[PDB]
């Protein structure tokens, strides 16, 4: 049996953990103790707040219908109330104590009806679509005009602020996203926006929508560009006007950060608060992309390693991204580096991502690594996305390991501290205290399909630790179970065994 050493230092690399890394798009079981919630994805592009209609685009035969009301548990009378998909979502946020992120429309049009499929000959402008206008430039109506050809976005923000107060209030909607995957508009939403979005286009639309939002609620955080994946990060999925605008910039990311900075300077307020991406791993194992299906042993191994692509300079995943564009990986430092250069101080969010294996120990383990990684790499907000319907048991386990490990919503600490391991392949470990030094939290996991290892911990810091309790989940139980205590710790050293495919949250006490 293998021995690994883990050195934890409470003095070293102390840094605040944004709680909004514990976030989601769809609510999961309801005991994960999320801190942030997002209403976003393909369906929100064409969502019309006046009648709650929306359009599926390429996901379901370009159907305009009441899917958001029905998926959101709304009765028909509720579906008829302006704003209801969104107010029902935000009401949930308030009950749960979460941050709300609410997507706003920017592709150009929103669903005028719920009659179903919109054919290629009915693409916008057509009786099937209402036109989006950022600034109404007229007195606002809490009950919008349902009979014209327009939906006013600043009017909807005023509706939210009238009902909830401004974002700086306790009950206010705090974040707004600038549509969703705009480099896929022409693919996902051809009936709305059939041409490939341009780089400049995207900037002008972002600036104009940010301005009308901020004129209503100067406290709201505005998130953009909500890029789907690397092809968009690189060149906005071959934008037509790229070669002409690219100049010195190394990728579209720099171009958007910089141009967002410039327009903000000219306006005299920050117009981009958060740099927003989605990240669905292209990582492969046994012929299978990890996001598509659970897969074989090799798929499951590749799922458990993939989170290293986020942070680890030494790691080369099997994917086209790592093959042709390795210079842009690991991806969080790379995005950080662009932010630092082109728009200092902009926050970073991963607003829709998933590692697959939703009901496999490999997905629970992947996620438990990822949550530790996001926390200590200056990510402000992150929001899981369900690629599979029904329950996502091991994803849910991962959150609960960090946020409700004992059934009493006890959590990881708010302060990352240095934690190192001698084996980055078979193990990962993430340490935290609270800003109360009494408790040291350690999430540790064994990624091996075969071999336990004994973890030899050495702790440095202000304090001496007497004992601890342990909680975990593994391949046979997705529910977190209390595990064997560490009844005595000699000289800030102790060994605990970590069976294969197991994740533990250890709480050491003084
Ligand atoms: O399958 C039933 C419903 O699908 C709805 O569309 C969803 C797609 O199923 C889903 O793949 C898509 O996920 C995207 C995400 O929106 C943005 N990032 O990438 C993910 C993977 O491509 O999300 C869609 C909902 O937004 C469809 O709208 C319904 O009509 C169907 O009933
Ligand atoms: Ca209208
Ligand atoms: Cl995109």
Short mmCIF file of C-alpha atoms and ligand atoms in Angstrom, two decimals:
data_model
loop_
_atom_site.label_atom_id
_atom_site.label_comp_id
_atom_site.label_asym_id
_atom_site.label_seq_id
_atom_site.Cartn_x
_atom_site.Cartn_y
_atom_site.Cartn_z
CA UNK A 1 0.00 0.00 0.00
CA UNK A 2 1.20 3.55 -1.15
CA UNK A 3 1.93 6.45 1.24
CA UNK A 4 1.35 10.05 0.05
CA UNK A 5 2.29 13.20 2.04
CA UNK A 6 0.20 16.28 2.25
CA UNK A 7 1.58 19.50 3.60
CA UNK A 8 -0.95 22.05 4.73
CA UNK A 9 0.18 25.56 5.76
CA UNK A 10 -2.33 27.92 7.37
CA UNK A 11 0.13 30.85 7.05
CA UNK A 12 0.65 30.47 3.32
CA UNK A 13 -1.46 31.61 0.30
CA UNK A 14 -4.42 32.74 2.41
CA UNK A 15 -7.22 34.09 0.16
CA UNK A 16 -11.00 34.68 0.36
CA UNK A 17 -13.19 31.98 -1.25
CA UNK A 18 -16.05 33.52 -3.07
CA UNK A 19 -19.13 31.73 -1.85
CA UNK A 20 -20.76 32.15 -5.30
CA UNK A 21 -18.53 29.34 -6.59
CA UNK A 22 -21.14 27.14 -4.91
CA UNK A 23 -23.75 27.73 -7.55
CA UNK A 24 -26.01 26.16 -10.08
CA UNK A 25 -28.32 26.69 -13.06
CA UNK A 26 -31.00 24.09 -12.26
CA UNK A 27 -31.78 23.38 -8.64
CA UNK A 28 -30.57 19.90 -7.67
CA UNK A 29 -31.95 17.97 -4.72
CA UNK A 30 -32.47 21.14 -2.53
CA UNK A 31 -30.08 20.27 0.36
CA UNK A 32 -26.81 21.33 -1.42
CA UNK A 33 -26.84 24.82 0.38
CA UNK A 34 -26.08 26.67 -2.83
CA UNK A 35 -24.96 30.37 -2.56
CA UNK A 36 -25.79 31.50 -6.14
CA UNK A 37 -28.36 30.68 -8.78
CA UNK A 38 -28.49 31.48 -12.52
CA UNK A 39 -31.44 31.67 -15.01
CA UNK A 40 -29.61 31.34 -18.32
CA UNK A 41 -28.89 28.87 -21.14
CA UNK A 42 -30.28 28.57 -24.72
CA UNK A 43 -33.89 29.18 -23.75
CA UNK A 44 -33.25 32.65 -22.23
CA UNK A 45 -32.01 34.24 -25.49
CA UNK A 46 -35.58 34.48 -26.84
CA UNK A 47 -37.48 34.68 -23.59
CA UNK A 48 -40.06 37.50 -23.66
CA UNK A 49 -40.80 38.82 -20.16
CA UNK A 50 -44.17 40.27 -21.16
CA UNK A 51 -45.79 36.89 -21.93
CA UNK A 52 -43.13 34.34 -20.67
CA UNK A 53 -42.90 32.77 -24.03
CA UNK A 54 -39.54 31.59 -25.32
CA UNK A 55 -38.01 29.58 -28.18
CA UNK A 56 -36.04 26.32 -28.19
CA UNK A 57 -33.92 27.11 -31.23
CA UNK A 58 -32.01 24.03 -32.46
CA UNK A 59 -32.67 22.13 -29.22
CA UNK A 60 -36.39 21.37 -30.10
CA UNK A 61 -37.56 22.33 -33.63
CA UNK A 62 -37.41 26.08 -33.05
CA UNK A 63 -40.48 25.83 -31.01
CA UNK A 64 -41.91 28.94 -29.44
CA UNK A 65 -43.92 27.78 -26.43
CA UNK A 66 -44.47 28.03 -22.64
CA UNK A 67 -41.67 25.62 -21.74
CA UNK A 68 -40.15 28.02 -19.14
CA UNK A 69 -43.49 28.27 -17.28
CA UNK A 70 -44.08 24.56 -17.28
CA UNK A 71 -40.49 23.62 -16.47
CA UNK A 72 -40.65 26.31 -13.77
CA UNK A 73 -43.75 24.84 -12.06
CA UNK A 74 -46.05 27.68 -13.05
CA UNK A 75 -49.82 27.41 -13.61
CA UNK A 76 -51.30 28.88 -16.73
CA UNK A 77 -52.60 31.92 -14.83
CA UNK A 78 -49.03 32.45 -13.56
CA UNK A 79 -47.57 31.94 -17.05
CA UNK A 80 -49.88 34.90 -18.00
CA UNK A 81 -48.38 37.32 -15.51
CA UNK A 82 -45.56 39.51 -16.97
CA UNK A 83 -42.22 38.52 -15.44
CA UNK A 84 -43.41 35.32 -13.78
CA UNK A 85 -40.65 32.92 -15.00
CA UNK A 86 -38.15 35.39 -13.60
CA UNK A 87 -39.95 36.51 -10.36
CA UNK A 88 -40.75 32.90 -9.51
CA UNK A 89 -36.97 32.06 -10.02
CA UNK A 90 -35.95 35.12 -7.94
CA UNK A 91 -38.51 34.40 -5.22
CA UNK A 92 -36.81 31.01 -4.93
CA UNK A 93 -33.44 32.73 -4.62
CA UNK A 94 -34.71 34.83 -1.69
CA UNK A 95 -36.13 31.87 0.12
CA UNK A 96 -32.79 30.04 -0.31
CA UNK A 97 -30.69 33.12 0.45
CA UNK A 98 -28.92 32.96 -2.97
CA UNK A 99 -27.48 35.44 -5.42
CA UNK A 100 -29.65 35.63 -8.59
CA UNK A 101 -28.03 35.96 -12.02
CA UNK A 102 -30.79 36.74 -14.71
CA UNK A 103 -30.06 36.58 -18.40
CA UNK A 104 -31.29 39.46 -20.57
CA UNK A 105 -31.94 39.31 -24.29
CA UNK A 106 -29.46 40.64 -26.80
CA UNK A 107 -29.73 38.52 -30.04
CA UNK A 108 -32.40 40.97 -31.31
CA UNK A 109 -35.82 39.38 -30.84
CA UNK A 110 -37.99 37.45 -28.45
CA UNK A 111 -40.94 35.03 -28.90
CA UNK A 112 -44.23 36.79 -29.63
CA UNK A 113 -46.30 33.63 -29.09
CA UNK A 114 -46.36 30.03 -27.89
CA UNK A 115 -47.71 28.36 -31.06
CA UNK A 116 -44.76 26.11 -31.66
CA UNK A 117 -42.22 25.63 -34.37
CA UNK A 118 -40.93 28.74 -36.21
CA UNK A 119 -39.92 27.83 -39.83
CA UNK A 120 -36.95 29.23 -41.78
CA UNK A 121 -39.29 31.46 -43.75
CA UNK A 122 -40.59 33.02 -40.45
CA UNK A 123 -37.13 34.10 -39.07
CA UNK A 124 -37.14 37.62 -37.55
CA UNK A 125 -38.59 40.26 -38.27
CA UNK A 126 -41.90 38.24 -38.52
CA UNK A 127 -45.25 38.04 -36.68
CA UNK A 128 -43.56 35.27 -34.58
CA UNK A 129 -41.06 37.72 -33.07
CA UNK A 130 -41.14 40.91 -31.01
CA UNK A 131 -38.23 43.32 -31.31
CA UNK A 132 -35.93 43.94 -28.34
CA UNK A 133 -35.28 47.58 -27.51
CA UNK A 134 -32.71 48.33 -24.74
CA UNK A 135 -33.95 51.81 -23.72
CA UNK A 136 -37.68 52.57 -23.87
CA UNK A 137 -37.13 56.38 -23.66
CA UNK A 138 -40.67 56.86 -22.37
CA UNK A 139 -42.55 56.44 -18.99
CA UNK A 140 -42.39 52.77 -17.82
CA UNK A 141 -45.40 50.57 -17.49
CA UNK A 142 -45.46 47.89 -14.75
CA UNK A 143 -47.96 46.15 -16.97
CA UNK A 144 -46.27 46.31 -20.38
CA UNK A 145 -48.02 46.87 -23.67
CA UNK A 146 -48.76 43.38 -24.99
CA UNK A 147 -50.17 44.72 -28.28
CA UNK A 148 -47.15 46.44 -29.90
CA UNK A 149 -44.14 44.88 -31.66
CA UNK A 150 -41.60 45.70 -28.93
CA UNK A 151 -40.16 44.37 -25.66
CA UNK A 152 -38.27 46.96 -23.62
CA UNK A 153 -35.41 45.62 -21.56
CA UNK A 154 -34.81 48.65 -19.33
CA UNK A 155 -38.60 48.54 -18.61
CA UNK A 156 -38.20 44.95 -17.35
CA UNK A 157 -35.28 45.97 -15.09
CA UNK A 158 -37.52 48.74 -13.66
CA UNK A 159 -40.22 46.16 -13.06
CA UNK A 160 -37.76 44.05 -11.06
CA UNK A 161 -36.43 47.03 -9.08
CA UNK A 162 -40.02 48.20 -8.38
CA UNK A 163 -40.95 44.76 -7.04
CA UNK A 164 -37.65 43.95 -5.25
CA UNK A 165 -35.57 47.14 -4.71
CA UNK A 166 -32.11 47.76 -6.30
CA UNK A 167 -29.31 45.22 -6.39
CA UNK A 168 -27.60 46.75 -3.34
CA UNK A 169 -30.75 45.91 -1.34
CA UNK A 170 -31.13 42.59 0.45
CA UNK A 171 -33.94 41.43 -1.86
CA UNK A 172 -32.74 42.87 -5.18
CA UNK A 173 -31.68 41.02 -8.36
CA UNK A 174 -27.90 41.45 -8.28
CA UNK A 175 -26.55 40.22 -11.60
CA UNK A 176 -27.67 40.44 -15.29
CA UNK A 177 -26.08 38.46 -18.14
CA UNK A 178 -25.74 39.71 -21.68
CA UNK A 179 -27.73 36.93 -23.45
CA UNK A 180 -26.10 33.51 -23.77
CA UNK A 181 -23.52 31.97 -26.11
CA UNK A 182 -23.70 34.65 -28.75
CA UNK A 183 -21.08 32.93 -31.01
CA UNK A 184 -23.62 30.16 -31.29
CA UNK A 185 -26.60 32.44 -32.08
CA UNK A 186 -26.51 31.58 -35.80
CA UNK A 187 -26.31 27.86 -34.93
CA UNK A 188 -28.59 27.61 -31.90
CA UNK A 189 -30.96 30.46 -32.76
CA UNK A 190 -31.04 30.85 -36.55
CA UNK A 191 -34.63 32.11 -36.49
CA UNK A 192 -33.52 34.99 -34.37
CA UNK A 193 -30.10 35.84 -35.59
CA UNK A 194 -29.11 33.84 -38.67
CA UNK A 195 -25.81 35.70 -39.55
CA UNK A 196 -22.63 34.78 -37.59
CA UNK A 197 -22.29 37.38 -34.83
CA UNK A 198 -19.46 39.90 -35.45
CA UNK A 199 -16.75 40.86 -32.86
CA UNK A 200 -17.59 44.56 -33.12
CA UNK A 201 -21.29 43.80 -33.29
CA UNK A 202 -21.01 41.85 -30.05
CA UNK A 203 -19.20 44.78 -28.34
CA UNK A 204 -21.73 47.40 -29.55
CA UNK A 205 -24.64 45.31 -28.44
CA UNK A 206 -23.00 44.64 -25.05
CA UNK A 207 -22.23 48.32 -24.43
CA UNK A 208 -25.69 49.49 -25.38
CA UNK A 209 -27.51 46.85 -23.23
CA UNK A 210 -25.12 47.45 -20.26
CA UNK A 211 -25.85 51.17 -20.44
CA UNK A 212 -29.59 50.81 -20.37
CA UNK A 213 -29.37 48.28 -17.47
CA UNK A 214 -27.05 50.45 -15.45
CA UNK A 215 -29.17 53.58 -16.00
CA UNK A 216 -31.91 51.77 -14.00
CA UNK A 217 -29.76 50.00 -11.43
CA UNK A 218 -26.21 51.30 -11.20
CA UNK A 219 -25.61 48.56 -8.59
CA UNK A 220 -26.36 45.59 -10.87
CA UNK A 221 -23.50 43.40 -11.96
CA UNK A 222 -23.37 42.88 -15.74
CA UNK A 223 -21.84 39.58 -16.93
CA UNK A 224 -20.51 38.96 -20.53
CA UNK A 225 -19.83 37.67 -23.05
CA UNK A 226 -21.17 34.23 -21.83
CA UNK A 227 -18.90 32.41 -24.36
CA UNK A 228 -19.82 28.72 -24.97
CA UNK A 229 -16.34 27.22 -25.18
CA UNK A 230 -12.87 27.54 -26.59
CA UNK A 231 -13.77 28.24 -30.25
CA UNK A 232 -15.61 31.32 -29.03
CA UNK A 233 -12.77 32.29 -26.60
CA UNK A 234 -10.35 32.04 -29.54
CA UNK A 235 -12.00 33.90 -32.40
CA UNK A 236 -15.72 34.14 -31.53
CA UNK A 237 -16.21 30.96 -33.57
CA UNK A 238 -14.58 32.42 -36.71
CA UNK A 239 -16.36 35.77 -36.51
CA UNK A 240 -16.50 37.28 -40.02
CA UNK A 241 -14.80 40.56 -38.93
CA UNK A 242 -12.08 38.90 -36.75
CA UNK A 243 -9.05 39.23 -39.04
CA UNK A 244 -9.88 42.87 -39.40
CA UNK A 245 -10.21 43.66 -35.67
CA UNK A 246 -7.74 41.27 -34.08
CA UNK A 247 -4.57 43.50 -34.37
CA UNK A 248 -2.22 42.72 -31.44
CA UNK A 249 -4.80 40.71 -29.33
CA UNK A 250 -3.99 36.96 -28.86
CA UNK A 251 -7.65 35.91 -28.86
CA UNK A 252 -11.22 37.19 -28.75
CA UNK A 253 -10.99 37.25 -24.93
CA UNK A 254 -8.45 40.09 -25.04
CA UNK A 255 -10.37 41.88 -27.69
CA UNK A 256 -13.58 41.88 -25.59
CA UNK A 257 -11.90 42.76 -22.30
CA UNK A 258 -9.98 45.66 -23.92
CA UNK A 259 -12.93 47.05 -25.93
CA UNK A 260 -15.17 46.72 -22.90
CA UNK A 261 -12.52 48.77 -20.90
CA UNK A 262 -12.39 51.46 -23.67
CA UNK A 263 -16.10 51.92 -23.90
CA UNK A 264 -16.35 52.01 -20.13
CA UNK A 265 -13.67 54.74 -20.03
CA UNK A 266 -15.64 56.75 -22.64
CA UNK A 267 -18.92 56.25 -20.71
CA UNK A 268 -17.22 56.93 -17.37
CA UNK A 269 -18.55 53.81 -15.59
CA UNK A 270 -17.60 50.14 -15.56
CA UNK A 271 -19.87 48.39 -18.14
CA UNK A 272 -18.50 44.92 -17.75
CA UNK A 273 -18.39 43.64 -14.08
CA UNK A 274 -17.82 39.96 -14.71
CA UNK A 275 -16.02 38.09 -17.52
CA UNK A 276 -18.35 35.18 -18.19
CA UNK A 277 -17.62 31.77 -19.76
CA UNK A 278 -18.97 28.23 -20.10
CA UNK A 279 -16.70 25.30 -19.99
CA UNK A 280 -17.80 21.80 -21.07
CA UNK A 281 -14.58 19.70 -21.08
CA UNK A 282 -13.44 18.22 -24.47
CA UNK A 283 -11.36 15.78 -22.48
CA UNK A 284 -11.55 12.14 -23.74
CA UNK A 285 -10.98 8.60 -22.24
CA UNK A 286 -11.78 5.30 -24.05
CA UNK A 287 -13.11 7.03 -27.14
CA UNK A 288 -15.67 9.11 -25.24
CA UNK A 289 -15.94 12.77 -24.40
CA UNK A 290 -16.51 12.98 -20.57
CA UNK A 291 -19.54 15.23 -20.94
CA UNK A 292 -21.46 12.84 -23.27
CA UNK A 293 -21.94 9.73 -21.12
CA UNK A 294 -20.41 8.05 -18.12
CA UNK A 295 -18.28 5.67 -20.28
CA UNK A 296 -15.66 3.00 -19.49
CA UNK A 297 -12.81 2.87 -16.96
CA UNK A 298 -10.68 5.04 -19.16
CA UNK A 299 -13.49 7.55 -19.57
CA UNK A 300 -13.91 7.63 -15.81
CA UNK A 301 -10.16 8.11 -15.25
CA UNK A 302 -10.05 10.91 -17.78
CA UNK A 303 -13.07 12.54 -15.95
CA UNK A 304 -11.20 12.51 -12.70
CA UNK A 305 -8.03 14.08 -14.25
CA UNK A 306 -9.76 16.68 -16.41
CA UNK A 307 -10.11 19.24 -13.65
CA UNK A 308 -6.24 19.63 -13.81
CA UNK A 309 -6.70 21.35 -17.21
CA UNK A 310 -8.13 24.21 -15.17
CA UNK A 311 -4.96 24.96 -13.21
CA UNK A 312 -2.08 22.54 -13.79
CA UNK A 313 0.71 23.65 -16.17
CA UNK A 314 2.11 20.13 -16.31
CA UNK A 315 -1.12 18.44 -17.54
CA UNK A 316 -2.00 17.49 -21.11
CA UNK A 317 -5.55 16.15 -21.44
CA UNK A 318 -6.55 14.11 -24.54
CA UNK A 319 -8.64 16.72 -26.53
CA UNK A 320 -8.37 18.96 -29.62
CA UNK A 321 -7.92 21.93 -27.38
CA UNK A 322 -4.82 20.46 -25.68
CA UNK A 323 -3.53 19.16 -29.12
CA UNK A 324 -3.58 22.44 -31.12
CA UNK A 325 -3.87 25.18 -28.48
CA UNK A 326 -1.97 23.97 -25.44
CA UNK A 327 -0.51 27.48 -25.07
CA UNK A 328 -3.97 28.61 -23.76
CA UNK A 329 -4.06 25.91 -21.07
CA UNK A 330 -4.35 25.67 -18.14
CA UNK A 331 -7.36 27.76 -18.71
CA UNK A 332 -8.00 29.74 -15.46
CA UNK A 333 -4.48 31.26 -15.26
CA UNK A 334 -4.74 32.01 -19.02
CA UNK A 335 -8.07 33.84 -18.63
CA UNK A 336 -6.67 35.53 -15.50
CA UNK A 337 -3.66 36.72 -17.48
CA UNK A 338 -5.97 38.32 -20.14
CA UNK A 339 -8.08 40.02 -17.51
CA UNK A 340 -4.95 41.42 -15.75
CA UNK A 341 -3.65 42.89 -19.03
CA UNK A 342 -6.82 44.25 -20.73
CA UNK A 343 -9.36 45.09 -18.10
CA UNK A 344 -7.80 44.97 -14.59
CA UNK A 345 -10.12 44.13 -11.76
CA UNK A 346 -12.89 42.45 -13.81
CA UNK A 347 -14.36 39.45 -11.99
CA UNK A 348 -14.26 35.99 -13.51
CA UNK A 349 -17.26 33.57 -13.71
CA UNK A 350 -17.80 30.03 -15.10
CA UNK A 351 -21.54 30.25 -15.46
CA UNK A 352 -22.35 26.87 -16.97
CA UNK A 353 -20.13 23.78 -16.83
CA UNK A 354 -20.19 20.06 -16.13
CA UNK A 355 -17.83 17.12 -16.00
CA UNK A 356 -20.44 14.42 -16.77
CA UNK A 357 -20.68 11.18 -14.80
CA UNK A 358 -23.65 12.75 -12.95
CA UNK A 359 -24.57 9.49 -11.28
CA UNK A 360 -21.06 7.99 -11.09
CA UNK A 361 -18.36 8.29 -8.34
CA UNK A 362 -16.12 9.67 -11.13
CA UNK A 363 -18.40 12.72 -11.53
CA UNK A 364 -18.61 13.21 -7.73
CA UNK A 365 -14.83 13.08 -7.46
CA UNK A 366 -14.29 15.37 -10.49
CA UNK A 367 -16.66 17.89 -8.99
CA UNK A 368 -15.02 17.76 -5.51
CA UNK A 369 -11.71 18.61 -7.08
CA UNK A 370 -13.26 21.36 -9.28
CA UNK A 371 -14.96 23.13 -6.34
CA UNK A 372 -11.59 23.29 -4.45
CA UNK A 373 -9.82 24.46 -7.65
CA UNK A 374 -12.38 27.30 -8.39
CA UNK A 375 -12.19 28.45 -4.81
CA UNK A 376 -8.50 29.01 -4.76
CA UNK A 377 -8.10 30.40 -8.27
CA UNK A 378 -9.95 33.68 -7.93
CA UNK A 379 -13.25 32.60 -9.59
CA UNK A 380 -16.04 34.82 -8.39
CA UNK A 381 -19.05 32.70 -9.47
CA UNK A 382 -19.62 29.26 -10.91
CA UNK A 383 -22.78 27.50 -11.90
CA UNK A 384 -23.18 23.82 -12.57
CA UNK A 385 -25.24 22.78 -15.61
CA UNK A 386 -27.33 19.57 -15.87
CA UNK A 387 -26.50 17.73 -19.12
CA UNK A 388 -28.66 14.87 -17.85
CA UNK A 389 -32.27 15.04 -16.68
CA UNK A 390 -33.40 13.52 -13.37
CA UNK A 391 -31.25 13.46 -10.31
CA UNK A 392 -27.48 14.05 -10.49
CA UNK A 393 -26.58 12.17 -7.32
CA UNK A 394 -22.76 12.40 -7.25
CA UNK A 395 -22.71 16.04 -8.42
CA UNK A 396 -25.11 16.69 -5.64
CA UNK A 397 -22.75 14.79 -3.22
CA UNK A 398 -19.82 17.00 -4.27
CA UNK A 399 -21.67 20.20 -3.30
CA UNK A 400 -22.94 18.69 -0.11
CA UNK A 401 -19.37 17.65 0.78
CA UNK A 402 -18.38 21.36 0.70
CA UNK A 403 -21.66 22.96 1.80
CA UNK A 404 -23.78 20.63 3.89
CA UNK A 405 -21.50 17.86 5.03
CA UNK A 406 -23.31 17.00 8.30
CA UNK A 407 -27.01 17.65 7.43
CA UNK A 408 -26.83 20.95 9.34
CA UNK A 409 -25.45 23.10 6.41
CA UNK A 410 -21.94 23.18 7.87
CA UNK A 411 -19.49 24.19 5.17
CA UNK A 412 -15.96 24.47 4.00
CA UNK A 413 -14.22 27.61 5.40
CA UNK A 414 -14.27 30.96 3.60
CA UNK A 415 -10.48 31.23 3.48
CA UNK A 416 -8.34 29.07 1.21
CA UNK A 417 -4.95 28.02 2.63
CA UNK A 418 -2.03 26.34 0.99
CA UNK A 419 -2.40 22.57 0.72
CA UNK A 420 0.15 20.40 -1.18
CA UNK A 421 0.38 16.71 -2.12
CA UNK A 422 3.17 14.41 -3.27
CA UNK A 423 0.88 12.71 -5.83
CA UNK A 424 -1.27 15.00 -8.02
CA UNK A 425 -2.44 12.08 -10.19
CA UNK A 426 -3.90 9.86 -7.52
CA UNK A 427 -4.94 12.58 -5.05
CA UNK A 428 -6.14 16.22 -4.72
CA UNK A 429 -6.54 18.16 -1.48
CA UNK A 430 -7.99 21.61 -0.60
CA UNK A 431 -7.66 23.32 2.76
CA UNK A 432 -9.48 26.17 4.42
CA UNK A 433 -9.99 28.00 7.68
CA UNK A 434 -12.42 30.72 8.74
CA UNK A 435 -11.69 34.43 9.35
CA UNK A 436 -12.19 31.64 13.89
CA UNK A 437 -8.90 29.79 13.35
CA UNK A 438 -10.30 27.04 15.68
CA UNK A 439 -11.16 24.69 12.76
CA UNK A 440 -9.08 23.55 9.83
CA UNK A 441 -11.10 21.97 6.93
CA UNK A 442 -9.41 19.58 4.43
CA UNK A 443 -11.16 18.01 1.43
CA UNK A 444 -9.03 15.11 0.21
CA UNK A 445 -9.80 12.52 -2.43
CA UNK A 446 -8.34 9.41 -3.99
CA UNK A 447 -8.81 9.26 -7.79
CA UNK A 448 -7.35 5.71 -8.09
CA UNK A 449 -9.81 2.96 -9.17
CA UNK A 450 -7.67 0.33 -7.29
CA UNK A 451 -5.47 1.40 -4.40
CA UNK A 452 -6.05 2.97 -1.08
CA UNK A 453 -3.26 5.26 0.01
CA UNK A 454 -2.42 6.40 3.53
CA UNK A 455 -2.32 10.20 3.69
CA UNK A 456 0.40 11.49 5.98
CA UNK A 457 -0.68 15.02 6.92
CA UNK A 458 1.70 17.59 8.34
CA UNK A 459 0.13 20.80 9.50
CA UNK A 460 1.88 24.17 9.97
CA UNK A 461 0.28 27.39 11.19
CA UNK A 462 -0.67 29.39 14.26
CA UNK A 463 -2.48 26.56 16.07
CA UNK A 464 -2.13 23.03 17.37
CA UNK A 465 -4.77 20.53 16.40
CA UNK A 466 -5.98 17.85 18.98
CA UNK A 467 -8.52 15.74 16.99
CA UNK A 468 -11.00 15.66 14.17
CA UNK A 469 -14.18 14.34 12.62
CA UNK A 470 -14.42 13.01 9.11
CA UNK A 471 -17.42 12.77 6.64
CA UNK A 472 -17.36 11.24 3.18
CA UNK A 473 -18.94 9.59 0.23
CA UNK A 474 -17.61 6.85 -2.07
CA UNK A 475 -18.52 4.42 -4.83
CA UNK A 476 -21.09 2.56 -2.63
CA UNK A 477 -22.73 5.56 -0.87
CA UNK A 478 -23.51 8.91 -2.57
CA UNK A 479 -25.07 10.21 0.72
CA UNK A 480 -22.46 11.71 2.95
CA UNK A 481 -21.72 9.37 5.92
CA UNK A 482 -19.89 10.25 9.12
CA UNK A 483 -16.58 8.31 9.08
CA UNK A 484 -14.03 7.21 11.73
CA UNK A 485 -12.81 10.17 13.86
CA UNK A 486 -9.14 11.18 14.22
CA UNK A 487 -9.36 10.73 18.01
CA UNK A 488 -5.73 11.99 18.58
CA UNK A 489 -3.12 14.08 16.68
CA UNK A 490 0.53 14.05 17.80
CA UNK A 491 2.59 17.11 16.94
CA UNK A 492 0.38 18.29 14.07
CA UNK A 493 0.91 15.06 12.17
CA UNK A 494 -1.60 12.24 11.50
CA UNK A 495 -2.24 9.56 8.96
CA UNK A 496 -5.65 8.67 7.53
CA UNK A 497 -6.31 6.04 4.86
CA UNK A 498 -8.18 6.94 1.72
CA UNK A 499 -9.79 3.97 -0.04
CA UNK A 500 -10.15 4.00 -3.76
CA UNK A 501 -12.77 6.36 -5.29
CA UNK A 502 -13.40 8.13 -1.96
CA UNK A 503 -13.74 11.80 -0.99
CA UNK A 504 -13.45 13.06 2.61
CA UNK A 505 -13.98 16.36 4.35
CA UNK A 506 -11.87 16.34 7.57
CA UNK A 507 -12.55 18.95 10.24
CA UNK A 508 -9.56 19.21 12.64
CA UNK A 509 -10.13 21.15 15.93
CA UNK A 510 -7.86 22.95 18.51
O1 LIG B 1 -34.57 18.07 -23.87
C1 LIG B 1 -35.74 18.75 -23.42
C2 LIG B 1 -35.67 20.25 -23.64
O2 LIG B 1 -34.44 20.78 -24.17
C3 LIG B 1 -34.40 22.19 -24.01
O3 LIG B 1 -33.14 22.68 -24.46
C4 LIG B 1 -32.07 22.42 -23.64
C5 LIG B 1 -31.11 21.42 -24.31
O4 LIG B 1 -31.68 20.15 -24.01
C6 LIG B 1 -29.78 21.47 -23.57
O5 LIG B 1 -28.82 20.64 -24.21
C7 LIG B 1 -29.24 22.92 -23.53
O6 LIG B 1 -28.00 22.92 -22.77
C8 LIG B 1 -26.98 23.83 -23.20
C9 LIG B 1 -27.13 25.14 -22.43
O7 LIG B 1 -28.44 25.77 -22.61
C10 LIG B 1 -26.00 26.16 -22.74
N1 LIG B 1 -24.73 25.41 -22.69
O8 LIG B 1 -24.64 24.18 -23.37
C11 LIG B 1 -25.58 23.17 -22.99
C12 LIG B 1 -25.33 21.95 -23.87
O9 LIG B 1 -25.54 22.36 -25.25
O10 LIG B 1 -30.18 23.70 -22.77
C13 LIG B 1 -31.47 23.80 -23.40
C14 LIG B 1 -32.38 24.63 -22.51
O11 LIG B 1 -31.73 25.90 -22.43
C15 LIG B 1 -35.40 22.74 -25.00
O12 LIG B 1 -35.40 24.17 -24.94
C16 LIG B 1 -36.80 22.14 -24.70
O13 LIG B 1 -37.74 22.49 -25.70
C17 LIG B 1 -36.75 20.63 -24.64
O14 LIG B 1 -37.99 20.21 -24.08
CA1 LIG B 2 -44.63 44.97 -25.83
CL1 LIG B 3 -20.49 31.91 -27.51
#
